[PDB]
Amino acid sequence: RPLGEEIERIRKGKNIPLRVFDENGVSSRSYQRFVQGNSELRISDLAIIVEILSISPMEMTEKLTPMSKTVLAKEQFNQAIFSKNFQESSRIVADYRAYYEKSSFALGKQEVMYSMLALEYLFNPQTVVTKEEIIALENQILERLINADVYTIFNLKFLALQKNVGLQPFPTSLLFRVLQSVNEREIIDIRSLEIIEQVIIDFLFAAIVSQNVPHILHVLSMFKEYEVGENNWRMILWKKIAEKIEMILTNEEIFADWSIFKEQILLSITLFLPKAKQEFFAGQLEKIEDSLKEIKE
Amino acid sequence: KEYMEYRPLGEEIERIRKGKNIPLRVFDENGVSSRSYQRFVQGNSELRISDLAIIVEILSISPMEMTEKLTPMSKTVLAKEQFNQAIFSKNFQESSRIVADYRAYYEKSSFALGKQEVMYSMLALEYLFNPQTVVTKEEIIALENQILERLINADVYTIFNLKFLALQKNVGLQPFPTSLLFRVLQSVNEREIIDIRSLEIIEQVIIDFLFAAIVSQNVPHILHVLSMFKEYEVGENNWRMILWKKIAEKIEMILTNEEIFADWSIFKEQILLSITLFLPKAKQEFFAGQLEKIEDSLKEIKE
Numbered sequence: 001r002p003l004g005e006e007i008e009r010i011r012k013g014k015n016i017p018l019r020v021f022d023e024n025g026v027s028s029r030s031y032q033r034f035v036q037g038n039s040e041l042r043i044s045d046l047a048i049i050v051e052i053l054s055i056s057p058m059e060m061t062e063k064l065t066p067m068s069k070t071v072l073a074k075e076q077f078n079q080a081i082f083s084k085n086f087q088e089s090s091r092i093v094a095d096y097r098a099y100y101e102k103s104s105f106a107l108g109k110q111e112v113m114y115s116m117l118a119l120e121y122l123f124n125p126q127t128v129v130t131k132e133e134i135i136a137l138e139n140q141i142l143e144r145l146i147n148a149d150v151y152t153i154f155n156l157k158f159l160a161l162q163k164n165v166g167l168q169p170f171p172t173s174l175l176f177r178v179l180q181s182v183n184e185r186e187i188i189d190i191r192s193l194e195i196i197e198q199v200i201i202d203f204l205f206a207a208i209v210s211q212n213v214p215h216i217l218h219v220l221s222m223f224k225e226y227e228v229g230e231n232n233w234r235m236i237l238w239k240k241i242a243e244k245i246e247m248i249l250t251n252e253e254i255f256a257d258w259s260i261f262k263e264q265i266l267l268s269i270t271l272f273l274p275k276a277k278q279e280f281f282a283g284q285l286e287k288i289e290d291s292l293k294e295i296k297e
Numbered sequence: 298k299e300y301m302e303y304r305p306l307g308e309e310i311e312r313i314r315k316g317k318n319i320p321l322r323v324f325d326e327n328g329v330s331s332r333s334y335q336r337f338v339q340g341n342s343e344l345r346i347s348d349l350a351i352i353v354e355i356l357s358i359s360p361m362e363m364t365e366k367l368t369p370m371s372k373t374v375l376a377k378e379q380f381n382q383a384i385f386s387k388n389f390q391e392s393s394r395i396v397a398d399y400r401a402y403y404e405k406s407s408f409a410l411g412k413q414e415v416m417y418s419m420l421a422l423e424y425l426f427n428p429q430t431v432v433t434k435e436e437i438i439a440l441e442n443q444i445l446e447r448l449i450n451a452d453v454y455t456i457f458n459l460k461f462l463a464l465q466k467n468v469g470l471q472p473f474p475t476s477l478l479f480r481v482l483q484s485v486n487e488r489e490i491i492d493i494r495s496l497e498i499i500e501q502v503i504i505d506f507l508f509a510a511i512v513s514q515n516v517p518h519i520l521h522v523l524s525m526f527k528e529y530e531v532g533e534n535n536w537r538m539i540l541w542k543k544i545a546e547k548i549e550m551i552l553t554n555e556e557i558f559a560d561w562s563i564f565k566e567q568i569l570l571s572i573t574l575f576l577p578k579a580k581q582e583f584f585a586g587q588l589e590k591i592e593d594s595l596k597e598i599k600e
Contacts, residue, residue, distance in 0.1 A: 003346070013453020014410065024407040025298020042343035044301040047369060054410035054457050057368040058492035064360040064367065066350030104326040107317065107357035150316020154357045188493050189361040194534065229493065231500070233536040233575040240574060268571035271543065272536040 003063045004035035010053045024048050058188065069099065074112045077119075086124045093120050093129065107144070111154055114141055118165045135167055145174055151181035153192045160199055172215075175203065179222060186227075200226060201238055205284060208291045213249060220246050234272070237265070241288075248292055255296075258289065299371060299407075306366040307338035313356050327355055361491065372402065377415045380422070389427040396423050396432065410447070414457055417444055421468045438470055448477060454484040456495040463502050475518075478506065482525060503529065504541055508587060511594050516552065523549040537575075540568070544591070551595060561595060 018028040026045045033039035050060045065071075073096045080089035093116045100113045114137050120129045141158060145151070155178050163170050179200070187193055200223060207219040223242045228235035244261050247253040262285055269278050321331035329348045336342035353360055360367065370378070376399050383392035396419045403416050417440050423432040445465075448458060458481050466473045482503065490496050503526065510522040526545040531538045547564050550556040565588055572581050 010453055010455065014451050015447070016410070020408050024409065040345045040347045043303065043306070043346055043349060043367070044343050046346060047301045047371070048299065050368075051371055051373065051411040052409045054414050054455065056456050056492075056495065058361070058364055058495065059455060061360045061364040061367045062491055064346070064349065064353075066354060066360075068350075068354055070354065105323060106327055106355045107319070108354035111357055144317070148317050150313055152313065152357060152362055153359055185362075185365075188364060189359065190491055190493060190496065190532070192359070192361070193493070194532075197534070229497075230577075230580070231497070231537050234534050236575050264570075265574065267567075268574055271567065271571055272539050277533075 002067065004037065004041075006063050007049060007053070008035045010055060014053060016053060020052060021049065024052055026052075070096075070106075070109050070112050073099075074116070077116050081119050081123050086126060089120060089124055090126075090128065093117065108154075110137075110141060111158055113137060114158065115161060118161050122165065131167055134165065138162060138165075138168060142171060142174075145171075145178070149181075151178045153182055153187075153189075153195065156182055156192075156195055156199060160195060163202075175199070176218075176222065183226065197235055197238075204238070204242060205288070208245065208288050211291055211295050213295065216245075216249065241265075245288065245292065249295065255293065258292070262289065301371065302369045303344065303366075304338075304340055305369070306344065306363070307340070309363055309366045310352060310356070310358075311338055313358060317356060319356060323355060324352065327351055329355075373399075373409075373412055373415050376402075377418065380419055384422050384426050387426075389429065392423060392427055393430065396420070396430075411457075413440070413444060414461055416440060417461065418464060421464050424468060424470075434470055437468065441465065441468075441471060445474065445477070448481070454481045456485060456490075456498060459485060459498055459502055463498070463505075466505075478502075479521070479525065486529065500538060507541070507545055508591070511548065511591050514594055514598050516598060519548070520552065523552075544568075548591070548595065551599070558596065558599060561592065565592060 018032070021028045021031055026048050030039055030041065030045075031049070034041040046060070073092060077089060077092045077096070080086070080092055096113065096116060100109055103109070117129050117134050117137060120127045121131075121134060145155060159175055159178060162168070182196070187196065204219055204223060207216045210216070220242055223239065228239060230236070244253070244258060248255070248258055265285065266282055269281055273281060321334070324331045324334055329351050333342060334348070334352075337344045352358075376395060380392055380395045380399070383389070383395055399416065399419060403412055406412060417437075420432050420437045420440060423430040424434075424437055444461060448454070462474075462478055462481060465471075485499065490499065507522050507526060510519045513519075523545050526542060527549065529542070531542060547556070547561055551558065551561055568588065569585060572584055576584060
């Protein structure tokens with residue numbers, strides 16, 4: 001659902017007549033054509049309209065989400081793979097590949113291409129997508145990342161997908177760079193938070209499992225810098241888990257303390273998790289505990 | 298017409314564009330005039346929405362990453378932040394002067410719901426926190442009823458309508474319009490909320506709503522609120538709201554006699570053993586307080 005339409009919906013739903021736009025110096029005519037599709041609209045005018053309709057800033061940026069050929073093809077593709085419709089998903093990747101190779105370069109297009117290849121490869125038992133294609137494209141995107149000095153949340157999406165695909169080693173130092181860049185601002189979008197939270201939890205888990213103590217400490221320090229709201233109880237808990245690990249690695253606490261902690265957790269997660277998720281979480285804790293025990297040899 | 302200052306947007310887009318090594322020719326290849334764009338960042342031109350949409354695809358930017366830059370602050374937003382830090386630093390001389398200037402700008406200006414809602418918020422906070430305010434009850438109530446009348450006749454609601462209602466209940470100068478809250482909640486939740494600040498507003502409002510309802514021992518109203526809560530969609534990872542939904546369900550099961558009081562007690566003790574992992578000890582004691590008041594109301598209703 002397009003922006004013009006959405007604004008018309010708020011405007012009629014809030015009984016604001018067209019005259020008000022004109023009183024605020026936004027031509028109603030140009031506006032009518034904005035909702036209609038016969039004209040564009042400057043962002044300054046949109047700002048005036050959102051104050052008129054008492055729309056919130058996030059409420060506004062949320063609608064700015066474009067709808068290109070790429071965006072459309074990618075939502076069709078996602079709905080195809082998630083509904084297990086693999087004929088559609090295959091045909092959409094082939095079409096999109098042709099469009100991608102003939103049209104103009106865009107990073108958003110590149111990341112969508114990679115994403116289609118990756119998901120087709122991971123979920124379609126009869127995909128024709130090859131590991132070679134995936135790796136060629138992967139290496140283009142990784143090289144852009146290496147040479148970049150600014151990162152955004154879609155770069156982090158790309159790294160989580162690359163790690164799930166598992167065709168090449170995961171670039172660790174690069175993950176640090178991406179996290180640092182993305183986290184220089186306060187993250188306000190719950191979908192980005194979901195991605196970041198999952199990446200850091202997995203990152204901490206993989207680090208413990210490696211038993212590389214300088215690396216574990218590095219990950220731990222990133223984790224202690226990562227800010228979580230007081231109402232984000234799950235991340236509050238992972239911060240406490242990371243802190244307990246830090247205290248055992250540095251001989252500030254002993255395994256008895258860890259066990260007391262772990263038992264408390266295991267009794268609490270009944271309230272928040274389905275029992276499947278519960279068993280997984282416990283499994284993670286046992287693996288952490290084992291790696292820790294082995295580190296303290 | 299009123300000025301909007303977008304050099305921050307120009308700056309942020311330029312920072313991302315150079316940080317990602319994308320040359321201007323790429324903007325032209327994708328149908329954004331590079332010269333129009335340069336004139337934008339320089340400040341001599343206004344950015345088209347069609348062009349911004351193309352640019353975020355080029356730089357692989359999620360628009361929400363840029364929210365702080367996509368929304369400059371007009372006189373109104375700026376004045377409200379000035380007022381806010383005035384009252385919070387308990388410096389009431391400034392707050393008095395700020396509301397005084399904003400009232401004048403408000404009466405001279407073009408009609409805007411956003412302006413109306415900031416005026417109300419200034420009157421309300423001035424009433425609540427500044428002991429020597431010249432703001433009157435009469436003034437607040439009149440503006441309150443204009444806003445309410447608009448809400449009553451609206452068919453669409455946004456998160457600021459919920460903010461307004463929460464503030465209205467703090468002011469307490471008129472009874473709280475309970476029916477209206479049900480309508481606003483129902484409307485706001487038909488779309489998915491993506492922003493943590495709206496989620497914080499919504500979550501606080503419905504937790505307060507459920508708590509007030511339980512404490513009142515008005516069982517039809519509690520059942521109405523319980524039903525609303527049961528429909529409220531929560532993510533897997535939002536452990537806090539998972540718990541409040543379970544609290545609401547335990548109360549629902551007990552009021553409809555599918556379960557008894559023993560089960561509540563079992564539940565409450567498990568919770569009390571858990572909150573140490575998630576909460577500072579202040580927050581712990583307060584949450585425990587709430588849980589005890591809920592138990593009191595349940596026990597009293599059920600005998």
